[PDB]
């Protein structure tokens, strides 16, 4: 094998099988070697000349919820067109239809993610952190205006470029890390809103500032404890809406004073602090809206309301496989 990663033509030379250590990666021949594994691999489409991240999802038809998780990510990402939301560049058809088991999705290529930035301990300009935050909120606005909640934002779900451009990925869960989950979500009360995403952003930004998770809970209850040890105990009843089952739980808890986030994180910019405090609030209804967060002074330099679009139209069980197949066919007319 010439190519470092072993590559071998398959099915009439219309597909290529790349080895990648015993677990083989089979894609359309338009993606010629080399490919770089980053299971996800970096590849170039020789026709469009564009480069992409190809993700292999193995045995997505085996389970119903895996299948629906997949189908949605596809339909959802295919619905969105936004600079801060990751785009699907290709969906790869199966070499033969009956054996369709593994499903490959090609997204646009990003260099890294916010998790890797944070973990790498590289310093960042204030303007960069600012830009990250702005882009997250900006994409989020669109998502929500499409009547969707991400519901799982974390640093690893935020893809980046050397250009510092940021795109959101890994959708699902909207109309196991608890660290970015909103209070209302730890207490069930299944009714919940866009504010849960806002919470996650606040948690992220602080992590970006302090370089460690803001609420690193070991379990469900430790999470809440750590939440309360910061934001303080909520107004007796006025900051409650939810099921009495959890109300009793919160009342039970010892009083927690609010901690000044400025004093705990003195290094960070005060405007940022202000915004975070508004983003981290026990009550969803007192939690700052995406819109107001974009309009917040900290983001004034980037804030342009005309450049912050909404979704023109909003969004929306085995042979869903056929659906995925149909879209793969949409991306690849030759097959």
Residue numbers in the entry: 32 to 69, 76 to 212, 225 to 365, 375 to 393
Direct quotes from the study:
Mitogen-activated protein kinase (MAPK) cascades, which are composed of MAPK kinase kinase, MAPK kinase and MAPK (called MAPKKK, MAPKK, and MAPK), are highly conserved signalling modules in eukaryotic organisms. MAPKKs are dual-specificity kinases that activate MAPKs by phosphorylating the threonine and tyrosine residues in their conserved TXY motif. Arabidopsis MPK3 and MPK6 were shown to be activated by multiple MKKs, including MKK2, MKK3, MKK4, MKK5, MKK7, and MKK9, and are involved in the regulation of biotic and abiotic stress responses and growth and development processes16171819202122232425. Activated MPK6 phosphorylates a variety of substrates, including enzymes, transcription factors, and cellular structural proteins21262728293031.
Here, we present the crystal structure of the unphosphorylated Arabidopsis MPK6 at 3.0 Å resolution. MPK6Δ1–28, a mutant with the shortest amino acid residue deletion in our experiment (with 1–28 amino acid residues deleted), was shown to be phosphorylated and activated by MKK5DD to a similar level as MPK6. The present model of MPK6 includes amino acid residues 29 to 395. The MPK6 crystals contain two protein chains in the asymmetric unit. Amino acid residues 70–75 (part of the glycine-rich loop), 213–214 (part of the phosphorylation lip), and 366–374 (part of the L16 loop) in chain A and amino acid residues 215–224 (phosphorylation lip) and 285–287 (part of the MAPK insert) in chain B were not resolved in the electron density maps. The N-lobe (residues 32–147 and 360–394) contains eight β-strands (β1 to β5, β0L0, β1L0, and β2L0) and two α-helices (αC and αL16), whereas the C-lobe (residues 149–359) consists of six α-helices (αD to αI) and three short β-strands (β6-β8). The structure reveals that although MPK6 is topologically similar to the non-plant MAPKs, the structures of the glycine-rich loop, MAPK insert, and L16 loop in MPK6 are saliently different from those of MAPKs. Compared with inactive ERK2 and p38α, the glycine-rich loop in MPK6 folds down onto the ATP binding pocket and is closer to the phosphorylation lip. First, the MKI of MPK6 does not form α1L14 (285–289) but only contains α2L14 (residues 293–301) and a 3/10 helix. Compared to ERK2 and p38, the structure of the MPK6 L16 loop does not fit in the groove, due to hindrance from the side chains of Phe364, Phe366, and Phe368 in L16.
